Design a protein around this ligand. Structure first.
Ligand SMILES: Cc1ncc(COP(=O)(O)O)c(CNc2cccc(C(=O)O)c2)c1O
Ligand SMILES: Cc1ncc(COP(=O)(O)O)c(CNc2cccc(C(=O)O)c2)c1O
Ligand SMILES: Cc1ncc(COP(=O)(O)O)c(CNc2cccc(C(=O)O)c2)c1O
Ligand SMILES: Cc1ncc(COP(=O)(O)O)c(CNc2cccc(C(=O)O)c2)c1O
Lengths: 322, 322, 322, 322
């Protein structure tokens, strides 16, 4: 489909239904040790190393209009992250997918955030032999879709800053391609953005290149060509979809080092994430990005990204059995 | 007191009593939302941001022979960490101390690990206003004292490596003076040490200086003078005690940049932490440190550190009301 | 003495004399292999490794009103730099000083820049044994005093930027306490400043701290206290003099890490260098520093720094034998 | 042609002729301000900013058996380097090539090192307007071919270390794709290698990846595939030739991040540079690389690289007019 008005109008209709629901799972549901629990009642062991040392990876696919979006790509990224961390998925994929679809169906949520967390488990790495660290724990939950930029704001764009008081954790400390919850730097960025009268922090690599922000990748558009950092960042599924969309809409996209100066020269800027989709930035460091309006290439990408949510290649329909 | 044999003999006697205990709190006790729970049964909310984004600081004081060691120094460090993170202790100090002493007394544990965790709470920073982030959560627990180096090994020293596949998260990403559970780099170090046939990883700053390791600070001893990194590291309470001990035993200690080459030139090497105390390193990168035996200055520090546990200035006695 | 008007008026009088001189050495004189040459005619061997690989250290003391300022401090810093580089001064100190004073006297220059360069010599390090690298070369020259900020501008202050396209070479690559001519980053900073409509670049360490700029150290003044970076920078003789001046004028000065945010919060900012002295900064990133006027503590330091040029403790008089 | 014995035998014959030459240019010739001078007599102005602030780029093509090797690739790299530095070639390309060929012919040198240096000139960047910095200086010289690894050693391989006391200057300080003479870190590496009983330092990026060394790129060979760092390094013409050679000999080569651990796992290691060609490394950190012998893929590359020196696509013949 894909115009802003159409995509958001459908969401608003579905949200109206969900907000009126008497289902105790309408606010979300968690899977904890084989049992489904309302999300706000869910609890995990204090001694889980996902809490004790954030010793975990995670991933967040999504459901849009009752259709899982690029689920296999998320599951493959999670499996790759687990392998890099010497973790292993505690359930085989068919059981993971059956469980997730059951949770979503039970909740009635049509536009959902769908998180999976794999932790080291109850035995810490420090002082253990490798064979003592194989009993890894899985937590999964769904909740209503979350917006890093609200729909109304996507029409006019948001306010970003290039963070100056913090830089991204370097890959030689923590590999940013391993999706993780060690957000110390990203939280510093969020506070700095708020202190500076903005919402979205763009972090550098401490070597004068752009990386990513607090829950999103960044794409610059300059003289008809798209640019996004290669290193120092999560290889986002939304970013992958932007690369797909650029090729399909017929634009060049370059995944390479992006010197931070390029941010100040950009014709258009957008953020991309599962938690909100395609999120234009129209003010940077208190100055407008070009004319301060959402750009034409941004809009082409926006439309294509959303159109993909109803295509077989990128999505599948959940049966809500209602 | 302070000889290895004496200190460890007392611990073994107290451990023998604890291991025979029928008290359901002998394996530890947690405080969760005002209620005491056996440690292995304790659970926290899934949505706590201490789990969802490791958005927390913590601290770990200890009890030795029924005496809290440097509790105020730990509580002041935790309060300073909270302030740096824009967190606040959810209970006033008198209530914190009363609760901790009650937990320890109830458990009967004489040699204890005593952890306090302050998290952002149930509302995430991303998308919040600062005034929405003030309802911070506190978790506290005690467990039997944990050894990063077992007593028997402290007689002969351990095996370390200088990590080559990972470096410490830089302070411009996460301030290492804020004690935290974002251990991605330290866990990489632990796996690298195990892969290389060692136990203790020393991480560099990625600029050819020594920092700290996975749960400890590092001190080098060279030509009668002690050296420990100033930047890039937690300002350990054990390290503070080593500085106190050095001054009292009459040695110079220098808290300054320590180029990594110094590790290879050291006369003695020790690690220091609340979880084990003073832990000699006698093999580095598969080669002996000097003669490969625990050094004389290390032993002087070891003895003084433990002697401090029975001095008023540094400790207070808990009434177990038994 | 020390008011701006008085100090600059004396310089202008002496400059008027020098500008009228018919002495062929009035524009400067070089010492090359034991011979004095007019500066603009001086030549060095192409194969000198100071040119072939910038394999050198240098230092620049100065003469003010016919008085060498802190010459021994410069010579001791040069000797320390040589030792760090495994170079050695090719002439003993008495011969160095006799030669420099003779050059200055011969030139008639009363306000002089006085440079010494020690290079590896004609044999490169690559492919040599250490004993083949001991024949180091010395070049010395004097020229009329050079202003990084012109006298008239010192009344109102200059325009700085925090560089965003470059960061300072880290000490684990090149030790910035070794004064050196490998200015690749500082030249990038200069071009960035010019591109951004400013004159003075302040470089960060790539970890969100202030370092130094292109030929100067940086001092911030905040709530009556002075602050200057400890690491990542040359330990300037002017900076040393500012520390002396602060203590004498009775202010606290802290030589420690300076987060870059502090630059944006400063009450006053100044740059310091032998090539110009004490140089106020009153615009930063296109915004005024406080009221955009030269601050009171800056002026106290300015006056004291210049007063030192006529004190025995810090200077000696050259006999021009005229 | 291309076997070691054949290639080196031809060089030895030509060297025998050159060593007997009575030509005053047989030891090299420099071009300085339009005049040819014997290399050991050549001198440059002291005030040239190539000396005063190493404010220059350079390049070093070569002549082998009287044939210039990949001259245009070197000249294009030099032109790109100049553009990045806001320098410009002071002579048009036809004059550069005519001059270089004349110098080589006059010298009689058949196997030559051929250096070009472009400096900022006599006006320093600091304190200048951009339009005052356009009078750039050119120096060119030829000298007999220089070996970073002597021919006899290439049969058995050399000794390398991974540097631990220094790391490569990061690209956000100085762009390593701009060939430059600011060798502070590389000289530290050379001294560290010598201190550790080795000849060749491999520097990391300070983030646990391999970069390059003191005058060479590094290629690892693992399970039939070649690997060489993408970032942090000069894009060597020899490296380009190795990429060409790998494709022609039919091997995969990957130009990507190379974690430093890979060096310790490699089947074969080689260094590559114009100053010596293809230089096997058979000892790393005092341990043999696999069997400690020169590997089969290294030999295939070695042969192909040298074969290219007699092919039209990659070389042209100089007329010595003898
Ligand atoms: C650091 C970072 N970088 C990039 C992205 C975008 O990645 P995807 O295009 O694959 O979503 C993210 C997004 N991470 C993310 C996505 C959806 C939900 C949540 C949540 O837990 O609130 C987090 C992120 O956290
Ligand atoms: C990174 C790091 N650095 C230094 C220390 C030593 O700090 P103290 O001297 O203040 O203890 C630590 C120690 N951190 C620590 C101490 C005691 C117990 C536990 C645990 O949770 O297992 C962790 C640490 O984790
Ligand atoms: C990088 C850097 N940092 C600090 C200073 C100030 O140091 P002193 O306070 O010791 O001068 C410098 C100054 N370096 C300097 C000083 C005087 C003349 C020249 C020249 O060669 O033009 C260079 C410098 O080049
Ligand atoms: C840092 C660095 N990296 C890689 C190379 C290899 O680049 P080429 O494959 O393009 O040559 C170099 C080599 N640089 C080089 C090459 C030839 C001679 C000289 C000299 O001046 O002694 C220096 C170098 O100095």
């Amino acid at each position: 489909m894909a115009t802003m008005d159409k995509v958001f109008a459908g969401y608003a209709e579905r949200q109206a239904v969900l907000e009126a629901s008497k289902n105790p799972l309408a606010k979300g549901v968690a899977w904890i040790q084989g049992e489904l629990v309302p999300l706000h009642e869910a609890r995990i062991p204090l001694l889980d190393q996902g809490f004790m040392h954030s010793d975990l990876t995670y991933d967040v696919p999504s459901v849009w209009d009752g259709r899982f979006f690029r689920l296999e790509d998320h599951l493959n990224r999670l499996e790759a992250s687990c392998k890099k961390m010497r973790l292993r998925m505690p359930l085989p994929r068919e059981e993971v997918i059956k469980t997730l679809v059951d949770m979503v169906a039970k909740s009635g949520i049509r536009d959902a955030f769908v998180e999976l967390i794999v932790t080291r488990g109850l035995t810490g790495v420090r002082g253990a032999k490798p064979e003592e660290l194989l009993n890894n724990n899985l937590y999964m939950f769904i909740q209503p879709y979350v917006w890093v930029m609200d729909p109304d704001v996507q029409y006019t764009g948001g306010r970003a800053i290039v963070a100056r008081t913090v830089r991204r954790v370097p890959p030689g400390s923590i590999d940013p391609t391993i999706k993780n919850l060690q957000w110390g730097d990203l939280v510093r960025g969020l506070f700095e953005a708020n202190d500076r009268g903005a919402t979205y922090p763009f972090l550098t690599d401490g070597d004068a290149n752009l990386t990513e922000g607090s829950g999103f990748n960044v794409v610059l558009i300059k003289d008809g060509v798209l640019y996004t950092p290669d290193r120092g960042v999560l290889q986002g599924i939304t970013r992958k979809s932007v690369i797909d969309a650029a090729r399909s809409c017929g634009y060049e996209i370059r995944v390479e080092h992006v010197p931070i100066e390029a941010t100040y020269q950009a014709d258009e800027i957008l953020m991309c994430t599962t938690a909100g989709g395609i999120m234009p930035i129209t003010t940077l460091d208190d100055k407008p990005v070009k004319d301060g309006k959402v750009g034409p290439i941004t809009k082409a990408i926006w439309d294509r990204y959303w159109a993909m949510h109803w295509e077989d290649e990128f999505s599948f329909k959940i049966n809500y059995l209602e």
